[PDB]
Ligand binder design. Structure first.
Ligand SMILES: *C(=O)CSCCNC(=O)CCNC(=O)[C@H](O)C(C)(C)COP(=O)(O)OP(=O)(O)OC[C@H]1O[C@@H](n2cnc3c(N)ncnc32)[C@H](O)[C@@H]1OP(=O)(O)O
Ligand SMILES: *C(=O)CSCCNC(=O)CCNC(=O)[C@H](O)C(C)(C)COP(=O)(O)OP(=O)(O)OC[C@H]1O[C@@H](n2cnc3c(N)ncnc32)[C@H](O)[C@@H]1OP(=O)(O)O
Ligand SMILES: *C(=O)CSCCNC(=O)CCNC(=O)[C@H](O)C(C)(C)COP(=O)(O)OP(=O)(O)OC[C@H]1O[C@@H](n2cnc3c(N)ncnc32)[C@H](O)[C@@H]1OP(=O)(O)O
Lengths: 276, 276, 276
């Protein structure tokens, strides 16, 4: 007799069978099986397909449990107060930890707001990703953690999440930046976003733009703007202050960007007021 | 010809075949096999079943190599000076690292005492878990690391380990708390222990108890007591100082606790004097 | 229909099929397969054997892209400026992260020099390992990261890498030490190197040696020398200063060392000048 004591090697979420990148503290018994079921609406975990099915039949809403503060023909965003949806948010944090090297104690969700993005199609809502945000951040971080579910990665969803986080900051009349340190995956996504943003501004708004003007338009911090401008070699001094400027390289990058036919966030569709 | 260079994907310990959660620096060659044998008495590791068997036949004690400072009809605890049992303790630390995200250099065991708990039955002693403790802690930490072997997890052993660590502190006439930061699994276990402890005191000892009284009786720190009391909503001011108090919720939690018929540590059976 | 979304569970490098120890941010799509190909010359990654083959046929150099600053009948070392070989060095850093718990953002290679060691035989050059080094280190660290590829580990290559790093420091007229914190594997390798070095000096150079003399001869720091001397019990006071001294234990260790017939670095074959 050999008694197997297995690690969690796969989660079953709808039709997807996903392998974790890191360990996550699901409060489950270790057994001779190496899978659990994750319900794609409730995020509840189950050791058995039968227990999962039983709960699946129950009458539940088919989208994240919060206020829909943005809705276009491609995506919705739901704003959730961790304190008001403890169970669901804990479940979200356990799922997220499978794909992060480190993360704060999953159980304590009260200090956070969660902004969860769904794609909608003929079958309704499907959660594709989220970012959390501290209700009160000493450092003015506008994102605490950010995740695109692995089955949906590299489809442009992460960039939509980041863009949305800056629309919140703009509505708040504040600059902001993601919490440090960032994973390599996160930092490379932010650098691409920051780069695409400056490039788009230079072609669509004005050929020369000051640091203050960029900050006002984007809610990016001075530090992130300067780092990005130096990487693109577009930092100059004109009319007594620092600017970024348009050149052939930037025009070329812009046209390649547009060629990709990506979706973006429409600021006009954000129906939201800061807490005051 | 394909030469496979495998990671350690399973350890064989008695009848158990256990999958690691994290990497551990066993000083072994990488080969086309992905298992090692861990002897459940010596904790020695072997690349081959045959080498393991050879050493298994040798005449060895059948419990951890230290002084038995506690023995009841359910468990024993052995106190081991890392400096006096370097090999065995190094082996214990390698095994433990398989289930921890981080851990101090496994090789340097001299600064630690190890308290190892066995379950005893008709077959003798079986190591189920341990906690280490710094001989000298600047922060007064009463536990450095704590582990229940995975094949024995979720059976109540972790709570026994924690309870024992506080009996040491009480005998020492000191308050103490586990080393921070704690893993999520560790912190949730401590919170349950702290919660069960306050609840039991309120039903069994006195309906209202001051912070000083709790600390004296439990060796819990002021900080851990207050955090726990606020979570349970039982913090008040009475007769000129802060207390915790009994209510219907607490009574209900107590009866559910007792219903579970758990084993506890008997302070009378701890035969031990602090180093002086 | 079950859609599998797999983690990277094996890399194929020449004839070797290697299992990663940790996650690494290869910018690849997650699919129903769990392998990638790593070209053993370019370090480029490929999702398909066919794409790999296509690029393999192209005319490339068959050794690392830098200056060969050391060449004996066993190994070569190539010095590479990260800024001058960004692609190759990024690829090296992704490969290395598979075997490290943590590592700086793989993409930013400009601040580093890479010293890459090959073994040469009838088939030419084979990369077996490397160490990186900050062009400018505030702490005077003489190694930033160090790695022997897993298929080549425990063959003595790591010790050659370390020995080479100290020959650079000696040529620079500086003491140095590896960046902290070190992995357990790294620290145990350094301790063995430091120990073998002091033992060899005592038998081959002088029976009693001062701290200054050791530092001058080895580029080891005072701290690493004292730690190593205390571990070996060879620290004394003689003629008004601290020394290490030879004894029977040391002689015995030396003869066992020589018995192993290891290769070493020949300082005479390092053809190199510091940047000035
Ligand atoms: C916390 O502080 C922040 S740091 C922690 C970040 N989270 C984290 O590490 C969790 C795991 N990672 C992720 O969740 C995920 O990697 C993100 C969230 C970091 C990024 O999410 P996405 O994958 O969704 O990002 P995208 O917007 O898709 O961009 C990624 C790359 O994929 C390419 N892409 C995009 N759309 C594409 C289509 N249609 N076809 C092909 N390729 C596409 C993008 O170009 C982009 O960058 P690359 O140049 O590498 O592709
Ligand atoms: C260092 O600083 C400390 S932080 C590092 C902690 N270590 C660590 O992370 C290593 C890996 N983890 C462990 O070793 C392990 O998870 C512990 C030691 C943290 C906890 O050990 P146990 O698993 O043994 O703890 P228990 O006392 O069993 O309690 C755990 C949960 O299981 C439930 N339980 C208990 N007995 C049960 C029976 N008979 N039947 C069913 N369930 C039982 C308990 O209720 C308890 O909490 P849950 O509410 O999640 O169950
Ligand atoms: C950064 O700051 C530094 S800390 C990060 C270090 N890197 C890291 O962790 C990455 C992963 N690890 C490695 O790459 C690797 O483990 C090293 C680089 C740390 C060590 O490399 P090697 O494996 O090549 O080291 P060696 O010189 O081989 O010595 C290792 C042990 O193997 C034994 N050995 C050596 N030659 C042998 C032959 N011919 N036969 C049998 N055994 C041999 C050595 O004795 C040595 O120590 P042990 O006593 O454990 O063997």
């Amino acid at each position: 007799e050999v008694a197997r004591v297995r690690n969690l090697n796969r989660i079953i979420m709808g039709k997807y069978e996903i392998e974790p990148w890191y360990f996550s503290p699901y409060p489950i018994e270790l057994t001779d099986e190496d899978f659990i079921y994750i319900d794609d609406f409730t995020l509840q975990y189950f050791g058995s397909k039968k227990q999962y099915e039983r709960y699946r039949k129950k009458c539940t809403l088919r989208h994240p449990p919060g206020n829909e503060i943005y809705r276009d023909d491609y995506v919705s965003f739901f704003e959730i107060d961790g304190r008001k949806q403890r169970t669901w948010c804990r479940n979200l944090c356990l799922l997220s930890k499978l794909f992060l090297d480190h993360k704060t104690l999953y159980y304590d969700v009260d200090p956070f707001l969660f902004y969860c993005m769904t794609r909608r199609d003929e079958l309704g809502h499907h959660l594709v990703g989220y970012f959390s945000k501290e209700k009160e951040s000493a450092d003015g971080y506008n994102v605490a953690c950010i995740l695109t579910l692995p089955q949906y990665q590299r489809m442009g969803y992460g960039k939509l999440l980041i863009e949305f986080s800056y629309e919140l900051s703009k509505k708040e009349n504040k600059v902001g930046s993601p919490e440090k340190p960032l994973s390599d995956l996160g930092l490379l996504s932010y650098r691409a976003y920051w780069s695409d943003t400056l490039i788009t501004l230079l072609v669509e708004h004005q050929k020369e733009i000051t640091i203050d003007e960029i900050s006002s338009m984007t809610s990016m911090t001075t530090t992130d703007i300067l780092h990005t401008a130096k990487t693109l070699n577009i930092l100059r001094y004109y009319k007594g202050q620092h600017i970024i400027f348009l050149n052939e390289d930037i025009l070329d990058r812009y046209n390649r960007l547009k060629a990709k036919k990506r979706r973006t966030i429409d600021p006009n569709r954000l129906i939201w007021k800061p807490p005051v």
